[PDB]
Amino acid sequence: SQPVQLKIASYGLLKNLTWVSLENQVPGVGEVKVQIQAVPVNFRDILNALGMLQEHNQTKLGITSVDHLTFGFEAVGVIVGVGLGVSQWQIGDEVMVIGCHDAFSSFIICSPNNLVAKPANLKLIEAATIPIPFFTAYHGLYNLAKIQSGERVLIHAASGGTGQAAIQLAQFWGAEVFATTSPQKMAVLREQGIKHVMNSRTTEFANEIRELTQGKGVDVIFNSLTHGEYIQKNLDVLALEGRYIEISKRKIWSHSQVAQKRSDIKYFPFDLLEEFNRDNQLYYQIWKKLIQCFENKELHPLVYKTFPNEDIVEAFRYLQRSKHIGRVVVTMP
């Protein structure tokens, strides 16, 4: 059809998602225009559609009203315009886009610092599964937690995109992986070679890990569940001087609050987009290492299901339900 951008007419219902006309934009100094070909849905997109991040988005981002909210944090596509002062990108170049906020658009304008090259051995669509999960998992496990061979790591929500990336990375580095997921998905995790798999929908994992480790706990926790009593349960299973990586957005504890309960542990709450704001070379730097792993087949793209963009509402619901392991990738016309 015509150039479009995904919007939500008002907060609270996924059926309110609408493709609206997208006016043409020219890239300015230090900007590139990218024609989008495929975009994964992220859970943050669903929370935003539901209006569950209104406080967060108002303060840190420009978002005062639903009419300034856009969707999509990563994509794959082709460079179609190059602004003044941009070198080493050319029209026609295939790129992965990481860390935008409007990927669900026919075209986006962004910094070259948000672009990385596709591993040439992968199909474009496969490559779309990589950016948010692997950059988030690498940043948390390596840049922050500094995970070592032989250490025990608990990866929560391990069937989701980021959790799946974190399994691949932790296993590559030779950590002992403990995982939580929904009971229905435990069987698939087991066959990825995970020895210890537990229920993500109760706090029963605390006692189970205590028993499994005979009171020693785990060295690293990679968490995305904070609702209710999960944060405190995580603190209870963390080994002495362990590292707690927190990527949840709603209701997280401060460093001081964490220190009140466990003064010995390192605490890493983070948002990948804020970390890029601190260091605009973050994606370039991570990808310098990661692209080689994907080229050597040491890491691999994630399971996915595709949907055409006209089926955007069903694509969102399909991820919200997550009956099976798999990212949801939407193709653009």
Encoding tokens for residue 48?
């935003």
The response to whether 159 counts as a known ligand-binding position is yes
Is residue 282 within 8 Å of 7, Cβ to Cβ? no
185 marked as part of a ligand binding site: yes
- Residue 182 annotated in ligand binding: yes
The answer to whether 272 is a known ligand-binding residue is: yes
* Residue 210 in marked binding region: no
**250 annotated ligand binder:** yes
Longest dimension (CA), the chain: 61
Is 327 annotated among the ligand-binding residues? yes
CB 326 within 8 A of CB 305: yes
Chain position carrying tokens 């509402």: 313
Is 201 annotated to bind a ligand? Reply is: yes
Q: Is 98 annotated as a binding residue?
A: no
161 labelled binding-site residue:
yes
Q: What are the strands, taking DSSP E only, across 145-298?
A: 152-155, 176-181, 196-199, 218-223, 238-246, 266-269
Confirm whether residue 73 is marked as ligand binding.
Answer: no
Q: Cα(first)–Cα(last) distance of the chain, in Å?
A: 7
H-run or E-run covering 45: helix 43-50
Closest CA to 167 of 128, 143, 140, 199: 140
**Binding positions:** 159, 161-162, 181-182, 185, 200-201, 247, 250, 270, 272, 327
**Binding positions for NADPH:** 159, 161-162, 181-182, 185, 200-201, 247, 250, 270, 272, 327
